[PDB]
Structures are given as structure tokens and as C-alpha cells.
Amino acid sequence: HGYISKPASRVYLANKGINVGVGSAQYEPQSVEAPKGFPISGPADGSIAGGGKYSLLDEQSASRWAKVDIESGPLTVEWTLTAPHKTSSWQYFITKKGWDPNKPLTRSSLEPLATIEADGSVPNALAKQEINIPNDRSGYYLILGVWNIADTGNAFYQVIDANIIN
Numbered sequence: 001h002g003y004i005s006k007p008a009s010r011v012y013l014a015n016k017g018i019n020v021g022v023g024s025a026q027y028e029p030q031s032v033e034a035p036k037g038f039p040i041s042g043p044a045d046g047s048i049a050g051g052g053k054y055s056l057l058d059e060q061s062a063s064r065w066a067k068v069d070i071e072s073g074p075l076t077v078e079w080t081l082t083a084p085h086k087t088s089s090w091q092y093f094i095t096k097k098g099w100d101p102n103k104p105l106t107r108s109s110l111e112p113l114a115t116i117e118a119d120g121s122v123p124n125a126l127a128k129q130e131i132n133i134p135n136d137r138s139g140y141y142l143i144l145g146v147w148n149i150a151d152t153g154n155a156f157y158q159v160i161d162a163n164i165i166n
């Protein structure tokens with residue numbers, strides 16, 4: 001169990017009262033748990049942000065969500081792990097240049113951003129990965145972070161509403 005605390009995820013911002021209207025998700029930012037193996041297995045298209053668990057997180061419009069300022073260049077993503085587990089990988093995706101901010105999030109919406117493979121070890125409770133925020137684009141993009149658990153069929157899904165600045 002865990003969530004992305006910096007840059008703050010959509011559900012973490014709901015937990016801190018910055019996003020509103022997500023119902024039960026607001027109390028369990030650490031529990032957006034669904035099958036691993038994305039972008040094959042995992043949450044269904046249109047239900048990725050809520051992990052197939054929290055449907056109010058799946059709403060998508062230009063104005064719906066608070067956006068976190070992220071400058072282009074190197075970024076260290078921080079996960080707060082309320083229950084660290086043996087880990088097989090950390091995956092990051094970003095919406096494609098030209099994506100439609102008023103449509104549901106699907107596999108076809110995304111492209112790969114970064115993957116940090118892991119050796120099965122249990123990470124630190126503040127788990128950090130280095131990624132590169134591109135400078136080929138500006139403004140509102142979704143970044144999907146996925147924490148894949150080595151010893152179960154599951155993963156934790158953390159969409160971030162990013163404002164890429166350059």
C-alpha cells in the first residue's frame with residue numbers, strides 16, 4: 001500500500017482537501033490497488049485512475065482536477081509506502097502530445113515515460129525514482145505511476161495531474 005506524495009497524486013490531493021468530490025477514495029490514497037501487468041492486464045480503459053475501485057477518480061475534464069507544477073528536466077518521484085512490499089518494477093506513462101483532456105483515460109491515450117525495474121526487494125518507506133520530464137510539450141498532461149508488487153498479482157495506480165512548465 002502506498003501513494004505518490006511528490007508530485008502529489010490526484011488521490012493524495014483529495015486526501016488533503018485540494019481535490020474534492022471523490023467519495024471514499026479520499027480516505028485511502030494508499031489503496032488504489034488493481035492487477036499488475038499494465039498496459040495489458042490491470043484496470044479497464046476508462047477506470048485506470050480509480051484502479052477499478054474508485055470510480056469518481058475516473059472523471060476527466062480540463063477543469064476537474066488540481067494540477068501540480070512540474071518543470072521540465074530530471075524529477076525525483078516520491079512514493080509514501082504505508083505498507084512496503086517486495087517490488088518488481090515502477091512504471092511511468094504520460095498522455096501523448098495532443099491528448100484530449102476532456103476524454104476518459106485509456107491505454108491508447110498514453111505512451112511510456114520511464115520504467116525502473118526492481119529485483120524483488122522491499123523498498124524504503126519513502127521510495128524514490130528518477131525520471132525525465134520532457135521539454136517537447138507544455139501544460140496539462142496526465143502522468144500515471146504504477147507500483148508493481150513482486151509476490152502478488154497486484155499493483156498500485158497513481159495518476160498525477162501535471163502542469164509541465166518550460
Ligand SMILES: [Cu+2]
Binds near residue numbers: 001002083085
Ligand atoms: Cu499493501
